[PDB]
Amino acid sequence: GPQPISRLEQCGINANDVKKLEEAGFHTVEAVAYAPKKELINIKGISEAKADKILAEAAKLVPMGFTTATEFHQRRSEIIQITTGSKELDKLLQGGIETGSITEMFGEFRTGKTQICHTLAVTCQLPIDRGGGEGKAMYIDTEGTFRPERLLAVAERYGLSGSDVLDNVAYARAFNTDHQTQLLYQASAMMVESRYALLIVDSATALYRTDYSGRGELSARQMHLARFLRMLLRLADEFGVAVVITNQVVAQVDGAAMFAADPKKPIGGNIIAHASTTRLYLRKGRGETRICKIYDSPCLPEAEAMFAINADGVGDAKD
């Protein structure tokens, strides 16, 4: 059961300190042992040495090894946010693409997913103060639409060296789902050696459309997709990198529009709907302007922003 603070008396403290702790709402050994340092060093009638020895003597009884919300929010300033190259998108995302999570972007054709991936593959190499992540990038490609010339065009904008930028990007091509899953082991092996800040899969569901066909193969497809996403989550958690994946869309032909023009929803179903942390839905505007919307996020309200695709990558709409 609970251990009252009466044991502190035989542990080597006077009655004044335990009386003050009782008057401060502390009434058990466990609460004092797991209390944050500031909470019992900012109180009246205490000293730094007294608090340190109190923690040392309390840790003996209560078994330590449990994380607490304060000891979790204080340690997470490590989370870096990578700028997307557009001020509007950075403002919408409140900093940019977070690390240690999975971000998904889906939409129809020419919406700008590949362009955003290309821009991020360069922006992730900037110094932290400039908005980058100070690392390299991986690009796993399943469609064959990787263009280094866009990388060079983006690099010229920030005044970087083209040769170095092209040197600091790794590339692999996946020809089926088994190869796609197999590449992640080598991805981890290579992340061990060096410092990577980003991993990109484009697309994460293109090959599942045709590798498993019909209603008679849905279950195996979903199981394979779930295993792949679990591997991605393990990689992101272990190495503290940012994972960005893309997705396709499907039509709703059941006649359930009711003033909803040309409805469409992402493929992959509940498995990919649950695995991802932040989901972005890309649309098209007039000319070269696009609209980005927040589809799902644990800590962000739903809003919209407008960006554009220029000759130097993703940026802001000109006037």
Partner 1 sequence: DLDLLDLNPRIIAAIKKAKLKSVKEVLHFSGPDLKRLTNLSSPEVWHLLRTASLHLRGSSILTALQLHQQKERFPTQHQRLSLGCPVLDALLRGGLPLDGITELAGRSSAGKTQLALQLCLAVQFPRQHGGLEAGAVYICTEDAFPHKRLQQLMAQQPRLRTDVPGELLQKLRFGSQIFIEHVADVDTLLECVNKKVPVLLSRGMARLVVIDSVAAPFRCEFDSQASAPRARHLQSLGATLRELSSAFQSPVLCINQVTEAMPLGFWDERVSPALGITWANQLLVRLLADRLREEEAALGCPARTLRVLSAPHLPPSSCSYTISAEGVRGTPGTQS
Residue 133 binding result from ligand ATP, partner 1, Mg ion, none, given CB thresholds of 5 to 8 Å by partner type: none
Residue 282: strand pairing partners: 292
Asked if residue 302 binds ligand ATP (CB under 6 A), the reply is: yes
Taking the least distance from each CB to partner 1, the nearer of 85 and 133 is 133
What gap in Å lies between CA 1 and CA 255, rounded to an integer? 61
Asked if residue 287 binds ligand ATP (CB under 6 A), the reply is: no
Interaction residues for Ca ion, span 269-288 (CB under 5 A): 276
Give SS3 for 295.
strand
What gap in Å lies between CA 95 and CA 89, rounded to an integer? 9
Shortest Cβ 272–Ca ion spacing (Å): 9
Establish whether the linkage from the previous residue to 161 is cis, with ω within 30° of 0: no
Annotated ligand binding at 228? The verdict is: no
**And the tokens for 318?**
């000109």
What gap in Å lies between CA 196 and CA 139, rounded to an integer? 12
Cα separation values, 213 from 70, 173, 268, Å? 49, 22, 13
**β-pairing, 304-310 with 289-296?**
antiparallel
Asked if residue 111 binds Mg ion (CB under 5 A), the reply is: no
Q: Which residue in 184, 295, 306, 310 binds partner 1 (CB under 8 A)?
A: 295
Annotated ligand binding at 111? The verdict is: yes
Asked if residue 115 binds Mg ion (CB under 5 A), the reply is: no
Q: Which residue ranges make up the site for partner 1 (CB under 8 A)?
A: 1-3, 25, 28, 30-31, 34-36, 39, 62-63, 66-70, 72-73, 76, 100-102, 215, 219-220, 223, 226-227, 230, 233-234, 237, 252, 256, 258-260, 263, 269-271, 273-275, 277, 295-296, 298-299, 301-302
